[PDB]
Symmetry: C2
């Protein structure tokens, strides 16, 4: 019944949060670290980091609402709405201590509002490989002198008429493999077995739709964040980005400098978008050291 | 067999040009005007303008290579390669006199090189609703505060692994309706009957692939034009652009001023991309008046 194999010593479980049944994988002991995945993926993208982190922390990795084995949200897909589910989930497990947060891709979109509104609950923050929704996203190019651009998919996924679901249905494995590899530097880490697992998961009709609903809410999140951003983040923050094909480069740290007072950043040469898989060992090391300081 | 109904008094015919059988519709008497369609359509987009122009001109409307009933090109799909076919076709019917040219969308891409290389063969020029391929196209955004951007489809159509044909095959009628209407202001001119006609034509497998090969050659066309643009156009030119949803707005004229010495531009309010259909009366009047000087 599990969509992905659970690491030894971890449990797959469910918690109801505001009427929404969320799936997560949990292990370890100590202060809580929540890990939040992004588009095309599930909790499983963290499966190499989780056992190392569980040596020193309690580690929880949820499926975003509607993705993996988590139920769709009953409110909506904008960042402020989804962030409520994730914040209350973390609070069920760390009610008496601030917790750490690591997020990738749209996991950023779905956590930033709860970080900025509940700063006393967040001990340390790691964000990798996606902009915080704001006006800067309107500057990315539609097309480049080398071919397809990094984020033309924002428009593809946000289009109405269920454009993305209709074109991708029946071709979910084909599309996801193209999407992953077109934003990767290191494609060999994506075995046919691994692509099969991710494709089977997001091909569930409610999960295919949920994937794109995050993008259909992106302009709403941008508008939400315009007000939230008047309060800068005060906790220690680290950004990570790939320096290779598919990576955000220096954008990640430069944007975060406008949001956070105490921020450090690293660009990983030879790595693209999918840092936990393409560049697991150095990504894991940087996260662990930053969180363990 | 005709994919579209020929206007009364016109003939549907073919002509072999450098080994490629081009389809065209021809009527009228007098000096030659060639009308060149763009993406998603065929010669038929001109069918309301042709009877009017034919009162004063010989009018020819070819199908672009690979599209409508024309064979794919044997050289390639870059602007400079395709323009050879169109120039030679026009000169078969106007061997000793300059002709007029009207082009829409990627018809611009496929005619600009033969215009700049054979300026004495072009009496007057009308371009509407697309950039000439140059470095400006790398500045359009992937995503806008309103949502879908104008030209995110550049990356989609240019993507490798035949991404666009693989996703759109079997769904051509769905996709073309969405593409056309999302770039329109006056959407109700696109009846189901008309969409059926256009979709059946570009769903031919070689036409679906040809459609996207034009975008796969776009960066080559940009590199070609960087050299060709060192000479400005000297003949009278007019640009038209829609001012409504889907329209190029002031960009059309502002770019043309870098390419032409003698240019007047119009922005048609309440009109999007598909000027001949969305705004037939004002567009036809503008074109007929400009060519009748
Ligand atoms: C048709 C072509 O793809 C185009 C459409 C809209 C704007 C620019 C270019």
């Amino acid at each position: 019944a599990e969509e992905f194999p659970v690491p030894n010593g971890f449990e797959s479980a469910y918690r109801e949060v505001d009427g929404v049944k969320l799936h997560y994988v949990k292990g370890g002991q100590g202060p809580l670290v929540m890990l939040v995945h992004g588009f095309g993926q599930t909790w499983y993208e963290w499966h190499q980091l989780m056992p190392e982190l569980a040596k020193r922390f309690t580690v929880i990795a949820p499926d975003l609402p509607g993705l993996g084995q988590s139920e769709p949200p009953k409110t909506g897909y904008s960042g402020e709405q989804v962030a409520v589910y994730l914040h209350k989930l973390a609070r069920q497990f760390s009610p008496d201590r601030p917790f750490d947060l690591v997020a990738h891709d749209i996991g950023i979109w779905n956590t930033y509002p709860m970080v900025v509104k509940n700063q006393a609950d967040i001990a340390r923050l790691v964000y990798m490989q996606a902009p915080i929704p704001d006006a800067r996203i309107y500057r990315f190019p539609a097309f480049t002198a080398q071919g397809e651009s990094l984020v033309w998919h924002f428009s593809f996924f946000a289009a109405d008429d269920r454009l993305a679901e209709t074109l991708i249905a029946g071709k979910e494995r084909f599309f996801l493999e193209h999407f992953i590899k077109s934003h990767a530097s290191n494609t060999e880490v994506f075995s046919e077995r691994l692509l099969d697992l991710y494709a089977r998961s997001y091909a569930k009709p409610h999960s295919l739709n949920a994937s794109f609903e995050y993008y259909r809410a992106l302009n709403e999140s941008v508008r939400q964040n315009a007000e939230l951003a008047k309060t800068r983040l005060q906790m220690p923050t680290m950004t990570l980005a790939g320096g290779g094909h598919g990576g955000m480069g220096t954008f990640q740290l430069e944007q975060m400098k406008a949001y956070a007072e105490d921020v450090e950043g690293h660009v990983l040469p030879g790595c693209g978008h999918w840092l936990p898989e393409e560049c697991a060992a150095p990504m894991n090391r940087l996260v662990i050291d930053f969180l363990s300081r």
